[PDB]
Amino acid sequence: GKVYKKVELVGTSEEGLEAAIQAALARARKTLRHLDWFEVKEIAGTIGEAGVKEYQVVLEVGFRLEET
Amino acid sequence: GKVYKKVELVGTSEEGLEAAIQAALARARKTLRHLDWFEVKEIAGTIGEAGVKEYQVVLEVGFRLEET
Amino acid sequence: GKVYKKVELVGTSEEGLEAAIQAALARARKTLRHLDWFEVKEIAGTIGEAGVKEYQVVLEVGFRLEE
Amino acid sequence: GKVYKKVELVGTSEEGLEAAIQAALARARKTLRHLDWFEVKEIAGTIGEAGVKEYQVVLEVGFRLEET
Amino acid sequence: GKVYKKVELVGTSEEGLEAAIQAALARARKTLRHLDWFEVKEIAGTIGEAGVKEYQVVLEVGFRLEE
Amino acid sequence: GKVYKKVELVGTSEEGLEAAIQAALARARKTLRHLDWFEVKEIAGTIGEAGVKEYQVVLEVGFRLEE
Amino acid sequence: GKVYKKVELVGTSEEGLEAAIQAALARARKTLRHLDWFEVKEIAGTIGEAGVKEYQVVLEVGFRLEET
Amino acid sequence: GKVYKKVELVGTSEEGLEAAIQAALARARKTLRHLDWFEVKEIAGTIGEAGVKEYQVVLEVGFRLEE
Amino acid sequence: GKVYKKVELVGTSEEGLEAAIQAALARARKTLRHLDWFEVKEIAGTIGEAGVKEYQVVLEVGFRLEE
Amino acid sequence: GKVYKKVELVGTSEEGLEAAIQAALARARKTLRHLDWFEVKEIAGTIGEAGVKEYQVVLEVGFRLEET
Amino acid sequence: GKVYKKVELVGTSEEGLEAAIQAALARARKTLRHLDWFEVKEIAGTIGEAGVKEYQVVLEVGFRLEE
Amino acid sequence: GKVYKKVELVGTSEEGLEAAIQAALARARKTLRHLDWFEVKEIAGTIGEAGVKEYQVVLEVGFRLEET
Ligand SMILES: CC(C)(COP(=O)(O)OP(=O)(O)OC[C@H]1O[C@@H](n2cnc3c(N)ncnc32)[C@H](O)[C@@H]1OP(=O)(O)O)[C@@H](O)C(=O)NCCC(=O)NCCS
Ligand SMILES: CC(C)(COP(=O)(O)OP(=O)(O)OC[C@H]1O[C@@H](n2cnc3c(N)ncnc32)[C@H](O)[C@@H]1OP(=O)(O)O)[C@@H](O)C(=O)NCCC(=O)NCCS
Ligand SMILES: CC(C)(COP(=O)(O)OP(=O)(O)OC[C@H]1O[C@@H](n2cnc3c(N)ncnc32)[C@H](O)[C@@H]1OP(=O)(O)O)[C@@H](O)C(=O)NCCC(=O)NCCS
Ligand SMILES: CC(C)(COP(=O)(O)OP(=O)(O)OC[C@H]1O[C@@H](n2cnc3c(N)ncnc32)[C@H](O)[C@@H]1OP(=O)(O)O)[C@@H](O)C(=O)NCCC(=O)NCCS
Ligand SMILES: CC(C)(COP(=O)(O)OP(=O)(O)OC[C@H]1O[C@@H](n2cnc3c(N)ncnc32)[C@H](O)[C@@H]1OP(=O)(O)O)[C@@H](O)C(=O)NCCC(=O)NCCS
Ligand SMILES: CC(C)(COP(=O)(O)OP(=O)(O)OC[C@H]1O[C@@H](n2cnc3c(N)ncnc32)[C@H](O)[C@@H]1OP(=O)(O)O)[C@@H](O)C(=O)NCCC(=O)NCCS
Ligand SMILES: CC(C)(COP(=O)(O)OP(=O)(O)OC[C@H]1O[C@@H](n2cnc3c(N)ncnc32)[C@H](O)[C@@H]1OP(=O)(O)O)[C@@H](O)C(=O)NCCC(=O)NCCS
Ligand SMILES: CC(C)(COP(=O)(O)OP(=O)(O)OC[C@H]1O[C@@H](n2cnc3c(N)ncnc32)[C@H](O)[C@@H]1OP(=O)(O)O)[C@@H](O)C(=O)NCCC(=O)NCCS
Ligand SMILES: CC(C)(COP(=O)(O)OP(=O)(O)OC[C@H]1O[C@@H](n2cnc3c(N)ncnc32)[C@H](O)[C@@H]1OP(=O)(O)O)[C@@H](O)C(=O)NCCC(=O)NCCS
Ligand SMILES: CC(C)(COP(=O)(O)OP(=O)(O)OC[C@H]1O[C@@H](n2cnc3c(N)ncnc32)[C@H](O)[C@@H]1OP(=O)(O)O)[C@@H](O)C(=O)NCCC(=O)NCCS
Ligand SMILES: CC(C)(COP(=O)(O)OP(=O)(O)OC[C@H]1O[C@@H](n2cnc3c(N)ncnc32)[C@H](O)[C@@H]1OP(=O)(O)O)[C@@H](O)C(=O)NCCC(=O)NCCS
Ligand SMILES: CC(C)(COP(=O)(O)OP(=O)(O)OC[C@H]1O[C@@H](n2cnc3c(N)ncnc32)[C@H](O)[C@@H]1OP(=O)(O)O)[C@@H](O)C(=O)NCCC(=O)NCCS
Ligand SMILES: Cc1cc2nc3c(=O)[nH]c(=O)nc-3n(C[C@H](O)[C@H](O)[C@H](O)COP(=O)(O)O)c2cc1C
Ligand SMILES: Cc1cc2nc3c(=O)[nH]c(=O)nc-3n(C[C@H](O)[C@H](O)[C@H](O)COP(=O)(O)O)c2cc1C
Ligand SMILES: [Cl-]
Ligand SMILES: [Cl-]
């Protein structure tokens, strides 16, 4: 009778992969409660002159639905 | 003309798989209208002393979007 | 040696998953011989006012071909 | 960095595949802002007396999340 | 209690993707009854001098089994 | 810090799917400690005169490794 | 224009993989006309005292449908 | 003992899917010889104010290697 | 009732694919009992001056767990 | 016939992804010999108040079997 | 440090699977240097009156890029 | 419209995952123009006495084709 929902977010960062994920979670945190877990679905990114411009990490974020 | 949306839910139950799915659908039903179909994506669970503690079924629920 | 064929069937039931599979196999059994094994490919279903209306299980049924 | 969300929509149309996609995006457009890209996940459809009755295209639509 | 079968067909057409699907369905329609839905599994094709010679769409066609 | 191992087991049962999963876990539990979670990878089975003879559920069982 | 059907067969042989495929095709050609191509989907087998007992190759066989 | 190569190209077009595929093949055709077949791997696109801005079709193009 | 385990092995051989599989099964046979079936998951290999140096077949081997 | 075995491990770490992998491999190396290569299968993690609590990386580790 | 490229080839042969792979590698080795490994992605073929006419093996060939 | 090509590279590095990606892009950048995006397909590596010897990241690099 616990139900969870998963939403698909993409985090981005110039710094690295961890930072990309943290960006997604940090935005999730602002409006969604009872965030429990995340799964990484894809890693992609953009390229510029210095190599990687932006890391982009597609993740599913699971959280418990409040009842009623 | 019709457009549907799919949301990803995870039902849980100590009783069985069917019970887990029904849990997800019961919760969806409280706030969503025109639920039409579901697809099971993963079946997993936690383990305790008596075996399966919790069945967890990841499912996509599809429903028809109302008009604007 | 022997050759098998696999057919793709979808069983449905209001009772449960097992009942869905059994319904597919009970229909296969009516016309096909030497049914050996099955594989579940998808589980889906329809929704009504009581929750699950119909469980739908898509399976591949393997059977030995007669020469 | 920026964060994006992906939602899973299913467009339908009697005309063709392109019209199915457009139907989804047209409905997205009514309530969502900063729609950026889409990915097609499945193509399916229903069958009637004249062949295809309805094309159905399951797509993920990605859009930029606004701040705060 | 209803059971469906799925058959795997490949439609081809020089015109386009829709026309390839319709071709598969038209041929199905000739001999099969209670065709309900289809799923597209692959899109491929052959190449000639003017580009696409033939669109080829692999689809699964599902239909209700009589009894 | 903590490291887990996953092992791939196949439970079987004539009764149903739940009973199959439990059979795997029950056998795991006899020799392995700190069983935490499982994932179902495939569902298959054998066919006899009465329909399903045996349900077979392939699962991955994860458990915490001791030091 | 032309429409093909794919059927899923499993060829078996104690000799090897090629022989398993050939067994499937040989049986196909006994009742099916206009066999064009095949795809290998899985390779499996049984084990005995001398190693492999039986190679089993699951293949899709494609053939051109005739007109009524 | 013929050998083929596959290259992965992405065609784009504002008009439709077919047009996107044709655009990739038209470019292929300029520099590559013995183009035989293609496979569509993904369909995606960009969104603008009028809906689809750009259809993008990722496809593998196969062609026979000369000696 | 019965429970099986699957272990993931990689056979190698310079001779061919069959020989690669057999090498994995011959080694399994040394220490494991009640080997029943195998599934090939990947086929890969290394390249040398004469072409294929080593065929590598990744397979899951299934066997019945004793009481 | 060299023969290799693959075992499926999950590494975890609060630091990052690299640290999670290294944890799995450090534990592997304590009891297993001739560790050759690894493949990452999934990246997931748990969420806490500061974002990522735990990175979890599922990997397959391949090693050469001795002989017996 | 090192960077590799993978190209996708399709070998064909009337003889067997092994000969199909060897053909792709033999052609690779004429123009490409530092060929290291290969992965088989698909196995297919064409059918004629004696059964298999042509085995076709899709493989990725990996090789180390020079300076 | 425009046409892009994707090429499949494998970047390696002893330092980490990011470094591996950057190595691939740095080598692409030497000879290819209009590099736009990348997709990570696999993460693997080799194992030595100190854990990870080499991180290996298989990625697809997309770039816009010039006009001929
Ligand atoms: C938070 C959440 C789980 C709560 O779900 P919930 O219990 O159903 O609450 P909701 O607000 O979604 O209620 C459903 C809404 O859709 C409407 N709705 C229900 N059926 C509908 C239908 N078929 N067609 C159109 N709208 C429908 C309901 O009327 C309700 O809207 P209302 O409040 O204006 O009346 C859900 O809204 C959610 O997951 N939001 C997205 C989270 C997210 O991704 N945020 C970004 C994080 S960075
Ligand atoms: C637009 C959107 C991105 C904004 O995300 P957001 O910043 O999280 O804003 P939301 O409206 O979803 O806010 C989260 C809501 O869920 C509630 N909520 C948060 N955690 C919850 C939980 N665990 N359980 C239940 N409810 C929860 C919040 O209270 C809030 O609802 P409230 O305003 O009634 O209090 C998001 O709402 C969304 O993606 N909507 C769906 C878009 C869509 O697919 N529309 C159809 C297009 S055709
Ligand atoms: C019901 C639903 C389909 C209706 O979709 P909708 O027509 O877009 O209605 P929404 O409420 O989602 O409208 C979009 C919202 O996102 C906001 N928004 C639009 N674009 C945005 C963007 N780029 N960034 C942030 N917010 C945005 C809109 O302002 C609007 O919120 P507002 O009313 O506060 O102004 C959708 O809200 C939904 O699927 N909800 C989740 C259902 C769910 O999972 N419930 C739990 C069931 S167990
Ligand atoms: C129409 C259909 C669903 C009906 O299925 P059904 O009830 O089993 O009817 P079938 O004709 O297939 O009956 C089984 C046949 O196989 C035979 N058979 C049964 N087991 C067998 C075995 N193990 N080995 C060989 N033959 C066997 C039966 O004897 C029977 O043949 P018979 O009437 O000559 O005695 C099924 O025949 C079908 O899906 N056909 C293909 C449809 C298709 O794809 N057409 C092209 C559309 S474009
Ligand atoms: C050969 C084949 C392509 C021809 O297809 P076809 O043009 O549709 O011809 P069919 O004989 O299958 O005709 C369809 C049959 O199903 C029946 N049928 C149609 N719809 C049905 C439905 N909804 N429910 C039950 N039966 C149905 C038709 O009445 C017809 O049977 P009938 O002649 O007794 O009236 C197809 O039968 C086939 O692929 N057979 C299997 C080939 C195979 O795998 N053989 C083994 C090789 S090793
Ligand atoms: C043969 C096999 C199926 C028997 O499994 P089993 O019934 O659990 O018997 P095991 O010997 O593995 O017993 C479990 C061991 O793990 C230990 N163990 C249990 N839980 C543990 C934990 N969480 N952390 C660390 N160790 C644990 C037990 O103490 C026992 O070890 P011990 O005998 O040193 O005390 C199993 O050992 C196996 O599949 N082996 C690998 C086969 C293989 O791949 N060989 C190569 C073929 S080429
Ligand atoms: C039972 C079965 C394995 C027997 O296969 P088989 O040995 O090839 O025998 P078939 O009856 O299929 O013979 C092939 C038929 O297709 C026809 N056929 C062969 N090549 C054809 C072609 N290229 N185009 C159209 N028809 C063709 C043959 O003429 C023959 O039909 P006919 O007897 O009317 O002349 C096969 O028919 C089958 O799998 N049927 C479907 C089983 C099923 O799903 N039943 C439903 C279970 S609930
Ligand atoms: C056409 C094609 C199949 C011919 O392949 P080929 O027979 O090997 O011919 P190539 O020109 O590629 O020869 C290999 C080149 O790589 C070089 N090379 C070989 N090994 C190398 C290595 N390990 N590291 C770096 N370069 C190497 C060779 O020196 C040669 O270059 P060079 O002529 O400057 O000395 C191949 O070049 C190709 O598929 N090109 C891309 C097609 C394409 O996608 N075009 C866009 C269509 S829209
Ligand atoms: C740069 C690139 C996009 C340009 O593609 P293009 O427009 O086709 O230009 P190409 O040089 O490849 O032209 C095709 C070549 O293949 C030859 N060719 C065409 N068809 C052929 C066939 N069927 N068999 C053998 N060769 C063929 C052409 O003759 C031409 O070679 P030539 O100039 O010696 O006459 C393409 O060459 C490419 O993607 N190269 C690889 C990029 C790469 O991965 N580099 C490493 C980065 S780390
Ligand atoms: C190291 C390893 C490759 C050696 O495999 P091996 O050559 O088969 O050696 P094993 O010890 O496993 O021998 C097989 C065992 O299973 C038993 N056995 C064989 N068949 C069996 C069966 N069908 N049912 C139950 N037990 C069986 C054998 O009796 C033997 O145990 P015993 O020594 O008590 O008699 C293997 O044990 C292994 O991969 N271990 C796990 C490594 C691992 O993941 N460690 C954690 C790293 S972090
Ligand atoms: C329990 C377990 C996690 C403990 O792993 P561990 O810490 O590595 O302990 P192990 O017993 O496997 O130790 C590794 C063994 O492999 C041997 N070994 C190490 N590298 C080897 C190699 N490359 N080749 C052959 N043998 C090797 C070691 O010498 C040791 O055997 P030994 O005690 O006879 O000297 C592991 O053994 C396991 O997962 N067992 C299988 C559990 C299982 O599936 N049981 C059935 C449940 S129903
Ligand atoms: C050998 C190889 C690795 C060397 O890669 P490289 O270091 O980039 O060398 P390239 O020839 O590809 O150099 C890039 C070329 O593309 C051109 N180019 C770069 N960006 C481009 C763009 N955006 N649009 C069009 N052309 C472009 C460059 O100008 C250069 O061509 P040029 O020498 O005529 O000026 C690469 O060419 C390759 O893998 N070739 C294919 C190998 C193959 O499959 N052969 C068949 C084996 S059976
Ligand atoms: C992409 C998609 C997938 C569907 N999958 C199923 C299915 O799994 N099983 C089923 O019975 N119906 C399925 N349907 C049909 C729907 O459940 C439903 O009957 C149909 O969309 C009509 O919806 P509406 O009456 O609300 O307009 C699917 C429909 C779509 C659009
Ligand atoms: C991503 C990738 C995948 C590889 N897969 C295999 C494998 O399938 N089997 C194998 O024996 N070697 C495999 N290798 C190892 C390489 O082929 C080779 O042994 C190693 O990269 C040394 O090459 P180098 O000397 O050119 O640097 C793989 C290497 C990489 C980079
Ligand atoms: Cl959502
Ligand atoms: Cl290339």
Query: Three-state secondary structure along E8-64?
Result: EEEEEECCCHHHHHHHHHHHHHHHCCCEEEEEEEEEEEEEECCEEEEEEEEEEEEEE
Helix (H, G, I), strand (E, B) or coil at G24: helix
Q: How far is CA H55 from CA D37, F53, H20, in A?
A: 10, 50, 7
- Domain borders along chain E are 1-67
Ligand 2 geometric centre to CA of D68 (Å): 13
Contact I18/G25 with Cβ under 8 angstroms?
no
Distance CA H58, CA H46 (A): 14
Ligand 12 pocket, residues with Cβ under 6 angstroms: H 5, 65; K 5, 7, 9, 27-28, 31-32, 65; L 31-34, 63-66
Element (H, E) at K53: strand K51-64
Distance CA F27, CA F16 (A): 17
Element (H, E) at C17: helix C17-31
Element (H, E) at J28: helix J17-31
Show Cβ contacts of residue G30 under 8 Å, excluding neighbours closer than 6 positions. none
Determine whether domain E1-67 maps to CATH 3.30.70.20.
no
Show Cβ contacts of residue J19 under 8 Å, excluding neighbours closer than 6 positions. J13, J55
Atom index in ligand 3 nearest the CA of residue D64 equals 23
Q: Does the beta-carbon distance from D8 to B3 stay under 8 Å? A: no
Instruction: Tell me which residue has tokens 């806490």.
Output: J48
Q: Does the beta-carbon distance from G51 to I22 stay under 8 Å? A: yes
Helix (H, G, I), strand (E, B) or coil at B7: strand
Strands (E), J1-68: 3-13, 35-48, 51-64
Q: Which residue type sits at G7?
A: V
SS3 breakdown of chain J: % helix, strand, coil, rounded to 5? 20, 55, 20
Q: Which residue type sits at K4?
A: Y
Q: How far is CA B59 from CA C20, C42, H4, L64, in A?
A: 18, 11, 41, 38
Chain A residues inside the 8 Å CB shell of D1: 11-14, 19-20, 23, 54
Instruction: Report the DSSP beta bridge partners of residue G65.
Output: none
Q: Touching E: which chains, 3+ CB pairs < 8 A?
A: C, D, G, H
Q: Domain spanning A1-68 has what CATH number?
A: 3.30.1660.10
CA nearest I9 in J: which residue? J5
For residue K25, give the nearest of G41, I55, J4 by alpha carbon: I55
Resolution of the experimental model, in Å, one decimal = 2.6
Strands (E), A14-50: 35-48
Instruction: Tell me which residue has tokens 């679905």.
Output: A41
Q: Which residue type sits at H52?
A: V
> Looking at the complex, does the CB of residue C4 fall below 8 Å from at least one CB of chain F?
no
